[PDB]
């Protein structure tokens, strides 16, 4: 994708993440765990449902039209009826092909984006207390129990609390 | 039974924007296209591992 997260610096997806689209996996002094990220999963989901509802919105209603099958050769007028219809179908067929091509490119890039956006938010909370290991994982340079990880996941992590401990571990 | 969209082959659902059943139609109908399938992504890239 354009952002290089999904199928990029995140080396692969997690078949085991079954209650969210994006999330966290951790290891600390109390063990390891997993949690869906609620906001991003929902951010991705709403856009895809939004686009989809736009796509499946409002078919046209048509009633009396033209004949499109003919049991006799008639020439000029039939040629024209068949040409108009054939033309209409090729145009719509083109529109249909183009619409899904564009949507899918956009669906893929927006999902890559949410991953990248989630990743960036995590980095920002952590300030100087962690480093990006480059594979979508952060190394946290302080003791960080389950409540601490959860504090990161729920967006209330207070970087200042751990900064002295962390900087000491990073640089000394 | 109940259906807004009717073709000479029979009624069809009109929940999808396109159809490949028949260029002849009556009612609130998807638009006829030549393709017999068109997939709209509704998820991210799938990258399974090992």
């Amino acid at each position, epitope marked *: 994708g354009l952002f290089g997260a999904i199928a990029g610096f995140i080396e692969n997806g*997690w*078949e*085991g*993440m*079954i*209650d*969210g689209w994006y999330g966290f996996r951790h*290891q600390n002094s109390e*063990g*390891t*765990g*997993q949690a*869906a990220d*609620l906001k991003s999963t929902q951010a991705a989901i709403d856009q895809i449902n939004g686009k989809l509802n736009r796509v499946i919105e409002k078919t046209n209603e048509k009633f009396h039209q033209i004949e499109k099958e003919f049991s006799e050769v008639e020439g000029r007028i039939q040629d024209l009826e068949k040409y108009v219809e054939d033309t209409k179908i090729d145009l719509w067929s083109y529109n249909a092909e183009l619409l899904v091509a564009l949507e899918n490119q956009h669906t893929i890039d927006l999902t890559d984006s949410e991953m990248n956006k989630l990743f960036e938010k995590t980095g920002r909370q952590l300030r100087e207390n962690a480093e990006d290991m480059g594979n979508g994982c952060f190394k946290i340079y302080h003791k960080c129990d389950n409540a601490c990880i959860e504090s990161i996941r729920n967006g209330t992590y207070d970087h200042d609390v751990y900064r002295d401990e962390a900087l000491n571990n990073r640089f000394q | 039974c109940i259906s807004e969209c009717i073709t000479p082959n029979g009624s069809i659902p009109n929940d999808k924007p396109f159809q490949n059943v028949n260029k002849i139609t009556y009612g609130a109908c998807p638009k006829y296209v030549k393709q017999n399938t068109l997939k709209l992504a509704t998820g991210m890239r799938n990258v*399974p*591992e*090992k």
Partner: antibody
Amino acid sequence: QVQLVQSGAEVKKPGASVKLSCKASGYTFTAYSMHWVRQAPGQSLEWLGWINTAIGNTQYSQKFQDRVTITRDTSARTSYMELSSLRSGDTAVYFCARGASWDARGWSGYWGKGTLVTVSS
Amino acid sequence: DIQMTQSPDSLAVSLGERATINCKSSQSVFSSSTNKNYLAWYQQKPGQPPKVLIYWSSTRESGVPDRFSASGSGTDFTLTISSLQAADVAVYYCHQYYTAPWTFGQGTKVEIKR
């Protein structure tokens, strides 16, 4: 083709130990949790515990933390459940089952055919 | 732990008729966090291992016929077999996976009424 091949039937006497195996194939092994659930005859299903297949950490049901240990061999694609100090009340079918997700917060979509273990003197 | 308790213990229904099994969990298995119910339903025929029919309390496993459906939220759940066929005669289990330990219901044996 997801498959779970469990060890053959086992008969053991009280106070002894047993170790069952579960051999997986058809899916990436370290991406799904493994669970061990038993069933006494004519009874309900009883979860014994689970193992995180990547890391290898476990947790067991408290009625079993004393005696059950769950293991995995990542190159073997295989799980192992070992029960000690067996009693007649441990006579049951022992299923291994793949979690729908590792971390155990997920149902089971694939169960092994079961291993009967009988405990009597 | 979270106790799963099914009702009724045994249920007899006529062929083609409707079958309805109920499940209550000792604590809620809904996560406001993920907006999902962590609940599953399994079928078990004698000798055979359990088979998921339904997960997320209301999602049907693939390949499972559409006559099975489940619903409910939080602590109240309901499995339904809309039009009972002979192969549906089995034991059904509900299953919470909201938290370890996994617990299951006691099981509802379902038979053909005649």
